[PDB]
Amino acid sequence: MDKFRVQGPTRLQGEVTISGAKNAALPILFAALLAEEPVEIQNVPKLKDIDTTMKLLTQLGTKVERXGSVWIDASNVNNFSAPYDLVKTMRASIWALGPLVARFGQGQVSLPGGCAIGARPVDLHIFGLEKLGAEIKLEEGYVKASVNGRLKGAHIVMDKVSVGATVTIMSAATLAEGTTIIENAAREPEIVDTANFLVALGAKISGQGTDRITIEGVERLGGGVYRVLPDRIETGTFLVAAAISGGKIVCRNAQPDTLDAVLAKLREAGADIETGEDWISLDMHGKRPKAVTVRTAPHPAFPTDMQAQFTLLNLVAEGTGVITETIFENRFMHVPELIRMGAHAEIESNTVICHGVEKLSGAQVMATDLRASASLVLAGCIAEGTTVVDRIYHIDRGYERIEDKLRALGANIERVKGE
Numbered sequence: 064m065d066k067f068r069v070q071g072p073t074r075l076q077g078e079v080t081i082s083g084a085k086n087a088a089l090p091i092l093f094a095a096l097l098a099e100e101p102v103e104i105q106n107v108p109k110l111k112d113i114d115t116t117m118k119l120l121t122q123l124g125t126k127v128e129r130x131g132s133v134w135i136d137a138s139n140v141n142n143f144s145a146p147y148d149l150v151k152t153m154r155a156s157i158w159a160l161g162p163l164v165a166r167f168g169q170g171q172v173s174l175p176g177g178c179a180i181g182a183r184p185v186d187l188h189i190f191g192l193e194k195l196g197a198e199i200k201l202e203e204g205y206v207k208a209s210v211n212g213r214l215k216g217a218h219i220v221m222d223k224v225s226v227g228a229t230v231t232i233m234s235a236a237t238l239a240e241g242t243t244i245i246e247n248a249a250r251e252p253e254i255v256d257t258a259n260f261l262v263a264l265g266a267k268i269s270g271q272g273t274d275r276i277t278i279e280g281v282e283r284l285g286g287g288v289y290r291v292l293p294d295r296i297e298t299g300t301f302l303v304a305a306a307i308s309g310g311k312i313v314c315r316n317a318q319p320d321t322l323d324a325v326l327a328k329l330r331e332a333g334a335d336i337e338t339g340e341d342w343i344s345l346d347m348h349g350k351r352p353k354a355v356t357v358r359t360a361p362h363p364a365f366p367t368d369m370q371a372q373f374t375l376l377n378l379v380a381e382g383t384g385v386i387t388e389t390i391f392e393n394r395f396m397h398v399p400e401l402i403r404m405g406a407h408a409e410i411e412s413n414t415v416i417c418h419g420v421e422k423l424s425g426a427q428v429m430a431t432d433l434r435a436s437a438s439l440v441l442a443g444c445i446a447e448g449t450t451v452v453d454r455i456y457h458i459d460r461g462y463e464r465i466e467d468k469l470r471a472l473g474a475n476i477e478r479v480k481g482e
């Protein structure tokens with residue numbers, strides 16, 4: 064069981080190159096199923112889900128190969144079933160459904176736990192496709208979709224805002240007969256990225272990033288080259304790394320506009336921030352951060368995915384600061400770990416009351432959540448002495464070589480093999 068052994072305190076400073084967003088790479092890889100011509104997807108991170116997706120794609124008849132890019136040739140897709148063995152470890156698997164039925168008139172995806180259980184978590188996907196005129200069958204442990212001829216454009220109103228369902232509907236709609244409108248579409252930068260990809264292939268889409276996406280169906284999608292946008296949350300994690308350690312950092316291969324709220328919040332903490340077309344710089348001028356008030360909310364507001372990171376910030380800042388989860392529930396389970404590190408905080412309802420301390424103390428800690436976990440690693444970096452963060456595999460699933468990146472920033476870090 065891999066562990067991160069950290070020796071603190073160390074100031075985090077210098078430069079880091081932000082990886083492509085896993086969450087944009089995924090829906091794009093699936094949307095590639097629509098492409099009749101070869102496609103090159105650039106800036107794709109080397110992460111478990113990407114490997115799983117590649118294997119899934121190959122099984123369908125797609126020719127796949129990777130390095131920094133992933134090369135895809137779906138001209139020959141001829142198997143329209145995503146099997147149990149290939150989908151099991153991954154929710155994103157459902158994204159194969161829409162493109163298959165949209166392009167091929169048929170497709171199916173295995174539902175772990177069977178139909179009764181597995182159909183529930185993907186109801187919005189099913190709803191969307193139905194709206195598009197597909198016949199959905201729940202049988203033999205699968206969710207099946209078929210349509211005679213092309214899908215049919217539709218006016219679709221979402222009762223729940225969903226990144227997953229928005230991608231399914233938008234992707235499928237690009238091949239539909241007519242106009243499709245998605246009301247209450249997810250606003251995520253990842254959605255914007257997937258829409259842009261689609262358009263690069265020849266799709267007609269507008270409104271991506273807003274509450275309303277309008278798609279005009281076309282007969283076929285071609286091929287081309289497309290670069291996946293930067294990981295906004297990874298970016299935020301590094302900015303915070305410097306912000307809590309008195310450091311200066313420059314984030315390369317970044318996209319400032321996906322981070323409005325985070326940058327604003329960092330400014331409130333006293334950070335000196337500068338931005339360019341593809342970079343972001345943060346300078347604490349050797350100063351401690353100032354406590355901030357944080358309210359997580361739907362994009363483009365403050366991201367819940369940045370919560371743990373800012374909670375940590377508050378824990379070592381000058382003053383008291385409160386972080387409120389306005390939508391999410393039971394998001395503070397990692398706080399007790401920080402307290403064990405010498406932090407002062409109270410969990411109240413949907414909030415955490417942070418009383419900043421000058422310095423943390425090394426300890427043996429662990430969190431199940433990916434974000435909470437990386438936060439523990441940052442904490443170790445600035446704490447006094449030795450910290451051991453257990454179960455880092457969680458981090459490995461969403462961070463591309465965080466140890467290398469941290470070390471290049473001055474961290475004293477070591478990956479330990481089963482303690």
Ligand SMILES: O=c1ccn([C@@H]2O[C@H](COP(=O)(O)OP(=O)(O)O[C@H]3O[C@H](CO)[C@@H](O)[C@H](O)[C@H]3O)[C@@H](O)[C@H]2O)c(=O)[nH]1
Nearest residue numbers: 086183184185186187188223224225226227228249367368
């Ligand atoms: O078929 C579906 C799909 C989603 N939901 C629900 O609607 C919400 C929307 O899901 P979705 O947007 O697709 O969430 P995730 O895909 O798990 O995660 C993305 O969407 C979240 C907001 O929902 C953001 O907080 C994350 O940062 C972002 O990565 C979920 O809580 C689900 O409970 C359904 O009931 N049926």
